[PDB]
Design a binder for this molecule. Structure first.
Ligand SMILES: CC1(C)CC(=O)c2c(N)ncnc2C1
Ligand SMILES: [Cl-]
Length: 445
């Protein structure tokens, strides 16, 4: 097992990885900004290093500082969690080059799946269902591009090859708007990503968001740990997630899971990963791979028994997968509510000090958060401050548990989405199950 790792993150996931390390006897190093000295996991870590000032760009995105910190402390591995540097191929490359274990995929793999055009092609080659699309970048020839649109069928959606998740992409319904939209999406991507490559895909009107969890060693073994539904979302941001996805049959699960597992073998995937699919009319369509742990991992954990973070550390230590596919069983149901520090009336992030905190408890209730009474939420980072996960023998039990658990939660001194969460749990369509990626905004206005 790894002697000592650096937790290249903050917030709830940093604490999450800390417990995992602790349970395994692994020494922890907390690298933090100057504004994050009072994080729970930083106060718990065996060792702390300040890697720079408050802004993420000079701290948590500061590669040289992170590696110096891993160097000074005598660490052997670096867990990047999610966001920040987790999908930065050059970070992963430099870690390995510096001689550390990178807790995640090889640099090439991140690069392959971090370019949506190259990602979709590797998925197509491995036999992963994708959205009908241009099967390459778009040219400057507008006769071609109007015919590609015809070949697939409007509506189509111009997307950025560098971007993703609503970032630099727009819907086109006729020929007249295609001319303007392509060159606009080209420039928008040239803005934040320094990549002007764009492609075309069929625009699905009303899809659900179903994604598959995978684990893989570096060594020709790969498994899938069922799926999650994450359709309930706001401006392309997940607000609620659940496992398994309502309506998905054991036949379909086996089908898509086997393909995802196979894809891991074809691309040489290592560590945890998720294949994100839009799900419509009984069909799946790949849209991007997150080559990293996800925020919503705990739902999969509850229903499968698998400590995903601990498997990540085991795979990193070079241990082959101890768990065979036929050992992984879906049992019960889990829902996760993202707890955000935000104005319920404006959705603007609401930082500040927490004057009274009370977490929910009881059978089936899992609370993942770094927050405590007296803790100050800084304005510099993501608004998500906690994750509440409720498991039960079935979906209705899990939902009823979430309802009661959200009414026990107290976070005073800052504004929270808690009461939106309460309102989403009570939604009569969410209770039937299977609402699509537009549902939440339709319910709101
Ligand atoms: C993120 C998103 C914009 C979601 C969506 O509506 C969509 C779609 N409908 N067809 C293709 N790709 C996508 C990606
Ligand atoms: Cl995530």
């Amino acid at each position: 097992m790894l002697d000592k790792i650096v937790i290249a993150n903050r917030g709830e996931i940093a604490l999450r990885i800390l417990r995992a390390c602790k349970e395994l006897g692994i020494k922890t190093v907390a690298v933090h900004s100057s504004a994050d000295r009072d994080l729970k996991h930083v106060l718990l870590a065996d060792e702390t290093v300040c890697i720079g000032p408050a802004p993420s760009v000079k701290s948590y995105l500061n590669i040289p500082a992170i590696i110096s910190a891993a160097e000074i402390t005598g660490a052997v591995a670096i867990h990047p969690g999610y966001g920040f540097l987790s999908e930065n191929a050059n970070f992963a490359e430099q870690v390995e080059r510096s001689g550390f274990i990178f807790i995640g995929p090889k640099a090439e793999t991140i690069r392959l799946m971090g370019d949506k055009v190259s990602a979709i092609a590797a998925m197509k080659k491995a036999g992963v269902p994708c959205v009908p699309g241009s099967d390459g970048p778009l040219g400057d020839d507008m006769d071609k591009n109007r015919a590609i649109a015809k070949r697939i069928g409007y509506p189509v959606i111009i997307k950025a090859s560098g971007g993703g998740g609503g970032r630099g992409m727009r819907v086109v319904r006729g020929d007249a708007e295609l001319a303007q939209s392509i060159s606009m999406t080209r420039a928008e991507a040239k803005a934040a990503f320094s990549n002007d490559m764009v492609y075309m895909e069929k625009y699905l009107e009303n899809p659900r968001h179903v994604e598959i969890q995978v684990l893989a060693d570096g060594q020709g073994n790969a498994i899938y740990l069922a799926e999650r539904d994450c359709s309930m979302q706001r401006r392309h941001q997940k607000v609620v997630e659940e496992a398994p996805a309502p309506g998905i049959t054991p036949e379909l699960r086996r089908y898509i899971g086997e393909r995802c597992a196979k894809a891991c073998v074809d691309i040489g995937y290592r560590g945890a990963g998720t294949f994100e699919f839009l799900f419509e009319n009984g069909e799946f369509y790949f849209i991007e791979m997150n080559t990293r742990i996800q925020v919503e991992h705990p739902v999969t954990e509850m229903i499968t028994g698998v400590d995903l973070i601990k498997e990540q550390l085991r795979i990193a230590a070079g241990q082959p997968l101890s768990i065979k596919q036929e050992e992984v069983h879906v049992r019960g149901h889990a829902v996760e509510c993202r707890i955000n520090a935000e104005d319920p009336n404006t959705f603007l992030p609401s930082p500040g000090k927490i004057t009274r905190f009370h977490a929910p408890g009881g059978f089936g209730v899992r609370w993942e958060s770094h927050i405590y009474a007296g803790y100050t939420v800084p304005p510099y980072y993501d608004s998500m401050i906690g994750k509440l996960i409720c498991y039960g023998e079935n979906r209705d039990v899990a939902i009823a548990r979430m309802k009661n658990a959200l009414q026990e939660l107290i976070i005073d001194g800052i504004k929270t989405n808690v009461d939106l969460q309460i309102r989403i749990m009570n939604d009569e369509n969410f209770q039937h199950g299977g609402t699509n990626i537009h549902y939440l905004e339709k319910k709101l206005g």
